[PDB]
Design a protein around this ligand. Sequence first.
Ligand SMILES: CC(C)CN(C[C@@H](O)[C@H](Cc1cc(F)cc(F)c1)NC(=O)O[C@H]1C[C@H]2CO[C@H]3OCC[C@@H]1[C@@H]23)S(=O)(=O)c1ccc2nc(NC3CC3)sc2c1
Ligand SMILES: [Cl-]
Ligand SMILES: [Cl-]
Ligand code: NA
Lengths: 99, 99
Amino acid sequence: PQITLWKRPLVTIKIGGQLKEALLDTGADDTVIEEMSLPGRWKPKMIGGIGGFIKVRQYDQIIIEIAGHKAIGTVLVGPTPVNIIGRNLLTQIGATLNF
Amino acid sequence: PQITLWKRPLVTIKIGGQLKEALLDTGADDTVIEEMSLPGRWKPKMIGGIGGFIKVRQYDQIIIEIAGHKAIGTVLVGPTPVNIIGRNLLTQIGATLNF
Ligand SMILES: CC(C)CN(C[C@@H](O)[C@H](Cc1cc(F)cc(F)c1)NC(=O)O[C@H]1C[C@H]2CO[C@H]3OCC[C@@H]1[C@@H]23)S(=O)(=O)c1ccc2nc(NC3CC3)sc2c1
Ligand SMILES: [Cl-]
Ligand SMILES: [Cl-]
Ligand code: NA
C-alpha cells in the first residue's frame, strides 16, 4: 500500500494478543507501545525525544503484525503518548519513504 | 528517491541560506528546527513529544528546501533534540510511505 501523509499514518497492529492503533513513524528508531503485558524477559531503558526522557521496558523477539504484515523485533513498553512503530519494525515490513 | 529505513532518514535542508541536517519524520505533524533566526513575527505553540510538552516559536510561510525539493510553510523553532521534517512539509515534497 501507499500511505499519504495528509493525516497521521495510523495502522492497526496486533501485539501480545491485543489490537492497538499505532503510528508508522520514520523518526522513531524503536517501537514504543503504551503499557501492556508482554511475555518473556525485559530490561529497563530510557528513551528521549521532545520534552525529555521516559523509562520503558525493553522486550526482545516480540512478534507483531503491522497492518497485516508479520515482523519480529524489540518492543519498548512505557508511558508513551502514542503507540509508535519505529524503524526497527518498519524495515521488516519493507516500508520505504518515497518522493 | 526511495528511502529505506535501516538507518535514520536524514537529509540536508536549506533554510535562511544555511544547510542543516534533518530527519524525515512521518510521526511528526509539524516541522521543528533547533534555535535559529527566521524573519517575521512568530506565534506561540506547545508541542507534546515523548517526554512532555515544550514551547516553540511558530513561523509561517518560511522558504525551506528539503533534499533539494522546495517548500514554503510553517517551521517551529525551539529546543528540539533533532531537526525534524514533519508531515506539513513532507506533503509539500510529495512524500509517501510505501510497503
Ligand atoms: C522527536 C523524534 C526525534 C523522535 N520521536 C518520534 C517522533 O515521530 C514523535 C512521535 C510522537 C508523536 C506523538 F503524537 C506524540 C509523541 F509523544 C511522540 N513526534 C513528536 O514528538 O511529535 C511531537 C513534536 C511535534 C511534531 O509535530 C507534532 O507532532 C505530533 C506531536 C508533537 C508535535 S519520539 O517519539 O520521541 C521517539 C520514538 C522512538 C525512539 N526510539 C529511540 N530509541 C533509541 C534512541 C533511544 S529514541 C525514540 C524517540
Ligand atoms: Cl529490533
Ligand atoms: Cl530493503
Ligand atoms: Na523476549
